[PDB]
Design goal:
This is part of a larger assembly, with chains A, B and C. In chain A, 74% of the residues lie in helices and 0% in strands. Helix content of chain B is 54%, strand content 7%. Chain B has five helices and two strands, in the order ααββααα. Classes of the chains: A mainly alpha, B mainly alpha, C mainly beta. At the A-B interface, α7 and α10 of A face α1 of B. Chain B: Belongs to the IFT43 family. Chain B: This is Intraflagellar transport protein 43 homolog.
Chain lengths: 375, 57, 309
């Protein structure tokens, strides 16, 4: 407040104050102060990328395009700048387009600030392009019609083995940079699922955790490696260990991932109440999380709450940008069982629009919903 | 798209950005207009047309 | 092309079919489990008619303007006087789907899951005649001589006024493309038949009763509009011959319909609007677009008004 009274245009003071408003749950003020700063300074990729994550954590991504247009109106060359390309790459990862996110991150990737931060998000996609719980038994036992194919296996493992090259482009400047680099190289080694690579990853994670007993990205490493090694009881406690800690903005993604992986293990245990707590705690720190809703919709369908399951599946349909035809099926099927046959048939059209020749839906959902429609 | 398929966005321009693999010039390269707008043709101009064209942009 | 909302109302329930008095003065709507009677001038709802137990899946109204037929999920059909009393109840084999009065003789039809029930005014019996399939929609030829039926099986078939079946067409794909409505074009000499009345009085009854239990077709001039859930519209002669080509769509159509003139088509559906077309199936415009699926689009008698449900 004193710094802003001494100079109102001090960006770091506005953003630090907005983060403190966000911690105090004054999210509307946090947003509005970054929006005012962008109305003073439209070409400001720090304030823009901060506002984009505030709007992701609020679940209000639709407000973002205004601020890209303001930068373009001020500066017709803004589209060429690595900070614009980084801000745009972040947006598409949240709307649901991992290929367009990669394209826009790639255009930023060599820049000393924006390219360094773009590279980490390219590595996130290249490790995990479907954004799954790595080793999560609720869904890695599924997708088998693609997951058993050499086409998905080799293209994903090339993305893993080349995320190591994106990590070779992340030159570190601090010991924390070396540690986070080494952890993500060992996430590449985990993602190979080759036992020696996964054991090496576990060993680096346990070595880092022995040096720093609260290092969340290493603790998630231990848990993920242990799950890939089928040592699931050793993963379980190393995730409970993370779940007791207070959240922070730096470890946030590894927190959100760890809670989701632990929620999957709780669904394997059938103690859904601790999974629902972890899924809702994840949403409280980040309301955008499609995987937090998709797991919760599956619990609502197991509980025979086909309406609340359809509410979760509607969010998952919407925030997939209608690219999840399995949720497409589930949403239509839950509307069919809810005695909402027109709404079920609406979605059976939207699935056939989203994917022609998509199996099962036409006969089972679409023709049974039609057959009921006048009884 | 693979990592290599994306890297095509940077692969060609690197030869203007960089010298001997030791030096990076990118700060200076901000001045350059792009090749397809810097290229010129052995084609004639007339004042009425040239004015009309420059007025139409 | 311009269209103006003259009035609006919303029922308590979904609206399944629409009927107009021939002079255009009253509108009747099959909403949920009752009939609703409306003034076409400003949408005042005069009365909920109470007779049925379950879902009124349709209503239709005879060319003399004395009597209307309404069909239910409770298996009943009721014949109502224009005095709004239900003088002759009837009870079919299963739930009713569509009902349609004949343009000429006032002979009624009433479709159901297997069986269609023809009768001519105040005779003592009904021809409950059998069908291969769920009988979705029904329409009389403009001269009154054939009742054409569309099937959920993607077939249209043509039956004479006695109930014998004379012609069939299958949409290529069968039950992939349910026939959800069909309409014969009004454009022939018979449209002025019943257009000359000035009777000033009506029939009256103590309490509601029950009713118990073809050549040279290529020279017949009539034309049939077919709307199928393969998302195509096409026109057909009584000979079974297709006219031109299938006018493709991007929605599940419903209630393909015409003005009194026979020259412009209304087309509702899962496009959630009422689209307007030429009698050649070329698009001309858009009557008001809607929050939800359109089941019904009925042009007013003698005039350019439209009503939608």
């Amino acid at each position: 407040a004193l710094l802003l009274q001494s100079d109102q245009d001090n960006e770091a003071a506005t953003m630090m104050m907005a983060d403190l408003m966000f911690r105090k749950q004054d999210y509307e003020q946090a947003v509005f102060h970054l929006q005012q700063l962008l109305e003073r300074k439209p070409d400001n990729y720090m304030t823009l990328s901060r506002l984009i994550d505030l709007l992701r954590r609020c679940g209000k991504l639709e407000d973002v395009p205004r601020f890209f247009s303001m930068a373009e109106k001020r500066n017709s060359r803004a589209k060429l700048e690595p900070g614009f390309q980084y801000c745009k790459g972040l947006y598409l990862w949240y709307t649901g387009e991992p290929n367009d996110a990669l394209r826009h991150f790639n255009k930023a990737r060599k820049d000393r600030d924006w390219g360094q931060n773009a590279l980490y998000n390219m590595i996130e996609i290249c490790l995990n392009p479907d954004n799954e719980t790595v080793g999560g038994e609720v869904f890695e036992n599924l997708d088998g019609d693609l997951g058993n194919s050499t086409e998905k296996q080799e293209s994903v493992q090339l993305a893993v083995r080349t995320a190591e090259k994106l990590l070779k482009e992340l030159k570190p400047q601090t010991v924390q940079g070396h540690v986070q680099l080494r952890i993500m190289e060992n996430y590449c080694l985990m993602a190979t699922k080759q036992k020696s690579n996964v054991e090496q990853a576990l060993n680096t994670f346990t070595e880092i955790a022995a040096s720093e007993k609260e290092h969340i990205p290493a603790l998630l490493g231990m848990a993920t490696a242990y799950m890939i090694l089928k040592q699931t009881p050793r993963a379980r406690n190393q995730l409970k260990r993370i779940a007791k800690m207070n959240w922070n903005a730096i470890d946030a993604e590894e927190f959100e991932k760890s809670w989701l992986l632990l929620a999957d293990i709780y669904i394997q245990s059938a103690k859904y109440d601790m999974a629902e707590d972890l899924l809702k705690r994840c949403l409280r720190h980040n309301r955008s999380c499609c995987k937090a809703y998709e797991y919760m919709g599956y619990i609502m369908e197991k509980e025979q709450a086909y309406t609340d399951a359809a509410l979760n599946y509607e969010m998952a349909w919407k925030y997939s940008n209608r690219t999840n035809p399995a949720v497409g099926y589930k949403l239509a099927f839950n509307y069919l069982k809810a005695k909402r046959y027109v709404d079920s048939i609406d979605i059976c059209h939207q699935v056939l629009e989203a994917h022609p020749t998509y199996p099962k839906i036409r006969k089972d959902i679409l023709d049974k919903a039609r057959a009921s429609l006048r009884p | 798209m693979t990592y290599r398929d994306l890297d095509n966005d940077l692969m060609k321009y690197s030869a203007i950005q960089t010298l001997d693999g030791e030096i990076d010039l990118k700060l200076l390269t901000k001045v350059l207009a792009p090749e397809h707008e810097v290229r010129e043709d052995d084609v004639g101009w007339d004042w009425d047309h040239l004015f009309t064209e420059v007025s139409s942009e | 092309m311009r269209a103006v909302l003259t009035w609006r109302d919303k029922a308590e329930h979904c609206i399944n079919d629409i009927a107009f008095k021939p002079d255009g003065t009253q509108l009747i709507l099959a909403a949920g489990s009752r009939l609703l009677v409306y003034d076409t001038s400003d949408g005042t709802l005069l009365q909920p008619l109470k007779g049925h137990k379950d879902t009124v899946y349709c209503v239709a109204y005879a060319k003399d303007g004395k009597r209307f037929a309404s069909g239910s999920a409770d298996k009943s059909v009721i014949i109502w006087t224009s005095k709004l009393e239900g003088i002759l109840k009837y009870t079919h084999n299963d739930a009713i789907q569509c009902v349609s009065y004949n343009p000429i003789t006032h002979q009624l039809a009433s479709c159901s899951s297997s069986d269609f029930g023809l009768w001519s005014p105040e005779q003592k019996s009904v021809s409950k005649h059998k069908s291969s399939s769920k009988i979705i929609c029904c329409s009389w030829t403009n001269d009154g001589q054939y009742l054409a039926l569309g099937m959920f099986n993607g077939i249209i078939s043509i039956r004479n006024k006695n109930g014998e079946e004379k012609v069939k067409i299958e949409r290529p794909g069968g039950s992939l493309s349910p026939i959800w409505s069909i309409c014969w074009n009004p454009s022939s000499r018979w449209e002025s038949f019943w257009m000359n009345r000035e009777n000033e009085d009506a029939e009256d009854v103590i309490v509601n009763r029950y009713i118990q239990e073809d050549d040279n077709l290529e020279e017949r001039n009539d034309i049939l509009a077919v709307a199928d859930w393969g998302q195509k519209v096409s026109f057909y002669q009584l000979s079974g011959k297709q006219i031109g080509k299938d006018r493709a769509l991007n929605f599940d159509p419903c209630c393909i319909s015409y003005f009194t003139k026979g020259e412009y088509i209304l087309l509702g559906g899962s496009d959630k609007q009422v689209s307007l077309f030429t009698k050649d199936g070329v698009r001309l415009g858009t009557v008001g677009e809607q929050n939800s699926w359109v089941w019904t689009c009925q042009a007013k008698p003698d005039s350019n008004y439209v009503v939608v449900g």
